[PDB]
A paper describes a structure:
The 14-3-3σ protein, which has multiple interacting partners with specific peptidic motifs, was used as a case study. We have observed this phenomenon first-hand with human 14-3-3σ, a protein which has several hundred known interacting partners in the cell. Furthermore, different isoforms of the 14-3-3 protein are function-specific. For example, the 14-3-3σ isoform (but not other isoforms) specifically targets p53 and is associated with tumour suppression, making it invaluable to determine crystal structures of the target peptide with the correct isoform.
Residue numbers in the entry:
A (entry chain A), C (entry chain A): -4 to 71, 74 to 137, 139 to 231
B (entry chain P), D (entry chain P): 384 to 388
The structure:
């Protein structure tokens, strides 16, 4: 890999510079290089990895949705030729490439070395997230992609329920995203709503144990659960 | 748009 | 080039799709491919070229300024090693690469085939703009880069004054940017202010000749001249 | 920031 000759610490330093410069493709390449050094990632480093790829794939998904909408309108309309489908396919292929890259880093070998709840649940949530992004564009093995997302989320949920308090931000964010999975991907809006509500209510009852700073961290994600519940009910 | 993390 | 096998019209169609998707790197690659077909560009196509590369180089310049500021602070401070300079240099090299690409398209062979005032002034303004972006990061042939920008702007100004009305949006935008060149690059704030004021005043006196739609087009750019005058005086 | 086109 092109980052093989750079020091692990330099890659992390440059990932942080890239974030400040809003250069998320560079940020992701730097964190990919750091992961490929083979050592486990710290809490901060896991966050950098997540931020980098979330921003990269977020641009691709937003573009894919614009192009998919144009394509759908085209099939409602003058024939414009193959260009809309071609260009949607180009963006889709690049998006799938990024998801495959992230899933490859998780499989080789982040997840198998992650033993603490905070690292293991984080990586399994990420695995669910990137299979979910694959599911968003899947039209053919679509069922297997969906089940791969579900299975990763479910393993993360099981660990988070046993090893983490209900206010833990990773547990909360996992539940938020698995709820979106149920709503958007699995055609299970009732499961989505039940999960978001139970997650919110159990976190509410645990806030009294927290410091002011942890309270702020947890209530921020609880607000996202409430936002989705408001949208869906 | 619905929220994810 | 990678676009050599795609139809000119398909490249233009996909450039417009890329703009809608805010995929400006794709947009620029598509318009580069269209230019390399060797035919002159229409008014609309020239705009697509300009929009694509302005957005690409705009992201790079914003990132370069963030990194340059961090680097300058580092030299005021703990030694952090070579990473800040290295990464600023990486972004700077990529930026220079984009400017060289645009200048290459103008030199081979957009400018030499552009005979109408609207095309020739547009391309010469663009040549001044991309030498100006090179000048922003130049620290060594810096004087020759600056003079290349000045010369391109000056030829564009001479043609626009002879062939275009004072309200012409291309003439106005050329004057705005040459004024910024004087202020920021050439260390000539008085020339910058004089140019912006005379340009504004001569456009003001010509507005009465315009339709409602042309009036809107011209006054929008006049407002940018006034904004700069307010900032600088 | 000053305006350019
Ligand atoms: Cl394409
Ligand atoms: Cl670098
Ligand atoms: Mg080492
Ligand atoms: Mg496909
Ligand atoms: Mg019901
Ligand atoms: Mg042809
Ligand atoms: Mg350099
Ligand atoms: Mg004076």
């Amino acid at each position: 890999g092109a980052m093989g000759s750079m020091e692990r610490a330099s890659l992390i330093q440059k990932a942080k510079l890239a974030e400040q410069a809003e250069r998320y493709e560079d940020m992701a390449a730097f964190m990919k290089g750091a992961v490929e050094k083979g050592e486990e990632l710290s809490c901060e480093e896991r966050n950098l990895l997540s931020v980098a790829y979330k921003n990269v794939v977020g641009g691709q998904r937003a573009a894919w949705r614009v192009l998919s909408s144009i394509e759908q309108k085209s099939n409602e309309s003058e024939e414009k030729g193959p260009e809309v489908r071609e260009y949607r396919e180009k963006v889709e292929t690049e998006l799938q490439g990024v998801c495959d890259t992230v899933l490859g880093l998780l499989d080789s070998h982040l997840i198998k070395e992650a033993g603490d709840a905070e690292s293991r649940v984080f990586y399994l949530k990420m695995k669910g997230d990137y299979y979910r992004y694959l599911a968003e564009v899947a039209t053919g093995d679509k069922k297997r992609i969906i089940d791969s997302a579900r299975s990763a989320y479910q393993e993360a949920m099981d660990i988070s329920k046993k090893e983490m308090p209900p206010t833990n931000p990773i547990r909360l964010g996992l539940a938020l995203n698995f709820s979106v999975f149920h709503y958007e991907i699995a055609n299970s809006p009732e499961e989505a709503i039940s999960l978001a509500k139970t997650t919110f209510d159990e976190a509410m009852a645990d806030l009294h144990t927290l410091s002011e700073d942890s309270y702020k961290d947890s209530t921020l994600i609880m607000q996202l659960l409430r936002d989705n519940l408001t949208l869906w009910t | 748009r619905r929220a994810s993390t």
